[PDB]
Amino acid sequence: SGFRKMAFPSGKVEGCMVQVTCGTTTLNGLWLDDVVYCPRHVICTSEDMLNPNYEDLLIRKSNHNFLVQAGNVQLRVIGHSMQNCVLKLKVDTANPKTPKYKFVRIQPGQTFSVLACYNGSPSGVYQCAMRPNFTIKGSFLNGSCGSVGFNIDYDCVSFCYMHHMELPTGVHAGTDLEGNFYGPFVDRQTAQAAGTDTTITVNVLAWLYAAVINGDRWFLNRFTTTLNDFNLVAMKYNYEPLTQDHVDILGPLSAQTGIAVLDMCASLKELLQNGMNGRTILGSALLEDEFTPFDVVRQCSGVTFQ
Amino acid sequence: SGFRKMAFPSGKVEGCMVQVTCGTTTLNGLWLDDVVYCPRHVICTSEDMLNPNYEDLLIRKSNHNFLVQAGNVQLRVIGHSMQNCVLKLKVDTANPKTPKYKFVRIQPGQTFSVLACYNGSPSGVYQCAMRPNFTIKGSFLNGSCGSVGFNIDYDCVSFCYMHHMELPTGVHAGTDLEGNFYGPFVDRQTAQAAGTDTTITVNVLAWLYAAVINGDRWFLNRFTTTLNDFNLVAMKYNYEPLTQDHVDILGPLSAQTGIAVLDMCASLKELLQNGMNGRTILGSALLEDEFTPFDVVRQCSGVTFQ
Ligand SMILES: [Zn+2]
Ligand SMILES: [Zn+2]
């Protein structure tokens, strides 16, 4: 038993991290097959970031202007191209440690593991969620740009995030592996507004099911409710509205615990209106929304990967 | 910026996990060089666990009674021996992926990463602390026995924990890699009492320094205090006493923030007596003690590994 904010094993991703250097800037890149992916602002100086013209900046650069370090090995940049906000540095050698991989664009509320790297060397791993406003609340220092987020499906690594920058507010923004930013953010140093951050209701409900599975039952109550009545209370406390698709995803958890989804919603409603009263749920004094219904089932059943 | 409960990259450890099967029981083992380490109760049936005589049980077993799976490869048990509570199955092949490793016995309050495995396959990774009562609050399901905890020093993997069992209270107990249990626990299915669990004061203080580094300053106050006055308040709320060694370890954090250790203690005292008042510190409504002073510096400076 027990419940922990669990990350995927990062072994398959560590073997893909390289150090990319262009001019004076150095950051991380993802080396799959014979292509290296990295944020395009590796070609920028600190002055350029204020208002960069990436096309003009990239035209001044040639293949031999990029230095790619795979630990102690050299990769020769033979071709270079810009796809949206990422650079695709075609190298001469294909990564022998390339895993079965796949590029995906996740949706808000989905969770993934981040491998924070500096100078192409792994530093740590943690799990986090894509906020509804398309930001992530991560842990990134200077030079962490290029670090990637990923999920693992048995034997496939699904790359979903590449880190690009820290907003003036301390939150983090990035792109998919095709270079398309999550959210309305651009890769320049300017004041950018992130939308209102709401709580991921479906994730909170999955977390409450995990608590029941692990022995925490005090928040259960004899009340019930409807979807509409619950939503109207949810939006007052900045909670994502619940749809029928959300109720469907929670089905398996409902069947394992014998607690109807709508009965759990009524319990959540009372928690929002009256609070926690200094008590805890799975060791937390706040409601946690960084566990998807899929994360809960896999940790409470023992899913593995190869 | 930002702060996250960060685990070490687990790539170096994934290549050492194997599946060990003896009779009908199957659990995880650690394959370093030509030796496989695993909990000795792999030789027990569900009935044996109630009161096992490990010497007599092991004498009925021969080298060919143990089945070691390294994914799709076979390892031939040529020699077997029992060291305290772990079995050392000497195999014919040396693990080619053996990293620079080292066995260590950590002290209470120290943190490490756990790689939860099932049937010798990695499932997830998380960071946790050794409680003062020598338990850990982890996430383990049936068959997770043999999963190991570890730290990484640049290029050395320091193995410090092997999981053995879940107590009736839901907490977890294990041994070092020499087979010596942490705490007064034995490897049998009986009611075992874990001591009073106290909060790791030095870790809480490091966490408050991390908050100041990241912008949370509201808990700072114009008060001060002495070590004795603070300790006397700490023990009322079940907090480990603070020694001079603890003050010394926090020196670097004191110098980076310009806040004297004793001034931070006075802030912590007021937090214990008056509470949080519904506010948060680094996104938490409770005081966190699973970050050592070393964890904080390494995440706020960007330490990497190879
Ligand atoms: Zn950058
Ligand atoms: Zn066991």
Side-chain angles (χ1 to χ4, degrees):
Chain A
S1 99
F3 211 69
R4 280 274 178 178
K5 180 104 52 161
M6 179 153 321
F8 293 98
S10 62
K12 302 174 145 43
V13 185
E14 292 167 49
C16 300
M17 308 303 312
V18 300
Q19 171 203 104
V20 183
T21 293
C22 179
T24 165
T25 305
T26 282
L27 43 73
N28 307 282
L30 182 68
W31 178 24
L32 306 162
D33 293 323
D34 61 346
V35 197
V36 168
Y37 308 79
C38 70
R40 64 175 176 174
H41 71 250
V42 69
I43 72 181
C44 294
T45 59
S46 266
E47 153 156 0
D48 291 327
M49 282 314 303
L50 291 167
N51 191 34
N53 186 296
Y54 283 102
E55 286 76 20
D56 286 348
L57 282 174
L58 185 67
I59 272 157
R60 277 129 56 141
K61 309 284 181 177
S62 291
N63 286 318
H64 56 247
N65 284 90
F66 299 96
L67 183 65
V68 177
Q69 268 228 315
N72 72 351
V73 195
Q74 274 61 275
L75 297 170
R76 209 80 60 77
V77 193
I78 304 326
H80 75 265
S81 100
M82 183 168 75
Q83 187 186 358
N84 302 299
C85 294
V86 300
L87 267 176
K88 305 225 293 273
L89 310 174
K90 204 246 180 53
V91 287
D92 59 356
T93 305
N95 185 359
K97 316 174 136 233
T98 291
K100 175 196 221 342
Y101 72 88
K102 160 166 42 141
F103 291 166
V104 303
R105 191 175 176 82
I106 60 167
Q107 294 285 108
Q110 284 198 264
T111 63
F112 57 94
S113 286
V114 167
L115 181 66
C117 297
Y118 302 87
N119 295 311
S121 298
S123 173
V125 62
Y126 55 92
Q127 184 93 342
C128 61
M130 182 72 90
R131 304 308 312 171
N133 66 1
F134 296 98
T135 64
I136 81 177
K137 302 176 136 185
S139 180
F140 293 113
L141 297 172
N142 176 67
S144 71
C145 303
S147 294
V148 302
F150 61 95
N151 294 98
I152 301 179
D153 178 14
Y154 207 169
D155 70 309
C156 193
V157 175
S158 285
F159 294 104
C160 62
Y161 178 84
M162 173 177 276
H163 179 57
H164 280 246
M165 62 192 24
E166 179 170 281
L167 298 188
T169 54
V171 293
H172 304 112
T175 71
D176 57 25
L177 265 296
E178 303 219 276
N180 301 124
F181 255 96
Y182 290 102
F185 308 115
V186 291
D187 50 349
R188 73 174 275 204
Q189 188 185 324
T190 186
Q192 306 190 45
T196 308
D197 193 14
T198 54
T199 304
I200 312 157
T201 305
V202 64
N203 289 3
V204 174
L205 291 175
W207 179 70
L208 298 176
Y209 275 111
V212 175
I213 291 176
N214 277 275
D216 269 309
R217 308 164 276 105
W218 65 264
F219 55 88
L220 295 168
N221 71 3
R222 54 188 322 132
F223 296 66
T224 175
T225 197
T226 70
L227 250 195
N228 268 239
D229 184 19
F230 166 82
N231 276 347
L232 257 290
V233 171
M235 318 205 239
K236 184 191 172 213
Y237 297 94
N238 301 291
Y239 268 65
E240 279 296 301
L242 217 68
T243 71
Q244 185 57 45
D245 298 356
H246 295 153
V247 169
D248 282 359
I249 296 172
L250 290 167
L253 281 178
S254 171
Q256 189 174 353
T257 64
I259 297 174
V261 171
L262 304 308
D263 281 345
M264 192 67 88
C265 290
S267 298
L268 179 57
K269 182 177 332 168
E270 224 42 71
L271 285 163
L272 301 174
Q273 292 174 327
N274 315 311
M276 299 275 281
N277 238 331
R279 291 177 92 191
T280 58
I281 299 174
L282 289 176
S284 176
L286 298 156
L287 307 178
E288 259 278 14
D289 70 346
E290 285 203 320
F291 293 94
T292 71
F294 296 113
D295 300 340
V296 170
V297 285
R298 88 159 161 271
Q299 187 174 152
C300 292
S301 80
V303 172
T304 56
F305 311 111
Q306 282 212 311
Chain B
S1 99
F3 211 69
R4 280 274 178 178
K5 180 104 52 161
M6 179 153 321
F8 293 98
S10 62
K12 302 174 145 43
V13 185
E14 292 167 49
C16 300
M17 308 303 312
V18 300
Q19 171 203 104
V20 183
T21 293
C22 179
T24 165
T25 305
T26 282
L27 43 73
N28 307 282
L30 182 68
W31 178 24
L32 306 162
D33 293 323
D34 61 346
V35 197
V36 168
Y37 308 79
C38 70
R40 64 175 176 174
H41 71 250
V42 69
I43 72 181
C44 294
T45 59
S46 266
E47 153 156 0
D48 291 327
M49 282 314 303
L50 291 167
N51 191 34
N53 186 296
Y54 283 102
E55 286 76 20
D56 286 348
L57 282 174
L58 185 67
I59 272 157
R60 277 129 56 141
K61 309 284 181 177
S62 291
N63 286 318
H64 56 247
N65 284 90
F66 299 96
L67 183 65
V68 177
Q69 268 228 315
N72 72 351
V73 195
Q74 274 61 275
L75 297 170
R76 209 80 60 77
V77 193
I78 304 326
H80 75 265
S81 100
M82 183 168 75
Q83 187 186 358
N84 302 299
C85 294
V86 300
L87 267 176
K88 305 225 293 273
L89 310 174
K90 204 246 180 53
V91 287
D92 59 356
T93 305
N95 185 359
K97 316 174 136 233
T98 291
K100 175 196 221 342
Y101 72 88
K102 160 166 42 141
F103 291 166
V104 303
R105 191 175 176 82
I106 60 167
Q107 294 285 108
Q110 284 198 264
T111 63
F112 57 94
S113 286
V114 167
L115 181 66
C117 297
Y118 302 87
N119 295 311
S121 298
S123 173
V125 62
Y126 55 92
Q127 184 93 342
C128 61
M130 182 72 90
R131 304 308 312 171
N133 66 1
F134 296 98
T135 64
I136 81 177
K137 302 176 136 185
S139 180
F140 293 113
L141 297 172
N142 176 67
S144 71
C145 303
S147 294
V148 302
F150 61 95
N151 294 98
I152 301 179
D153 178 14
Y154 207 169
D155 70 309
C156 193
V157 175
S158 285
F159 294 104
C160 62
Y161 178 84
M162 173 177 276
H163 179 57
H164 280 246
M165 62 192 24
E166 179 170 281
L167 298 188
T169 54
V171 293
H172 304 112
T175 71
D176 57 25
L177 265 296
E178 303 219 276
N180 301 124
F181 255 96
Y182 290 102
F185 308 115
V186 291
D187 50 349
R188 73 174 275 204
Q189 188 185 324
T190 186
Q192 306 190 45
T196 308
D197 193 14
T198 54
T199 304
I200 312 157
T201 305
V202 64
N203 289 3
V204 174
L205 291 175
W207 179 70
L208 298 176
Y209 275 111
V212 175
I213 291 176
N214 277 275
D216 269 309
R217 308 164 276 105
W218 65 264
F219 55 88
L220 295 168
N221 71 3
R222 54 188 322 132
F223 296 66
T224 175
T225 197
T226 70
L227 250 195
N228 268 239
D229 184 19
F230 166 82
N231 276 347
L232 257 290
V233 171
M235 318 205 239
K236 184 191 172 213
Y237 297 94
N238 301 291
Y239 268 65
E240 279 296 301
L242 217 68
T243 71
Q244 185 57 45
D245 298 356
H246 295 153
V247 169
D248 282 359
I249 296 172
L250 290 167
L253 281 178
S254 171
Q256 189 174 353
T257 64
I259 297 174
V261 171
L262 304 308
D263 281 345
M264 192 67 88
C265 290
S267 298
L268 179 57
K269 182 177 332 168
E270 224 42 71
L271 285 163
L272 301 174
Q273 292 174 327
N274 315 311
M276 299 275 281
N277 238 331
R279 291 177 92 191
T280 58
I281 299 174
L282 289 176
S284 176
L286 298 156
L287 307 178
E288 259 278 14
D289 70 346
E290 285 203 320
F291 293 94
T292 71
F294 296 113
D295 300 340
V296 170
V297 285
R298 88 159 161 271
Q299 187 174 152
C300 292
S301 80
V303 172
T304 56
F305 311 111
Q306 282 212 311

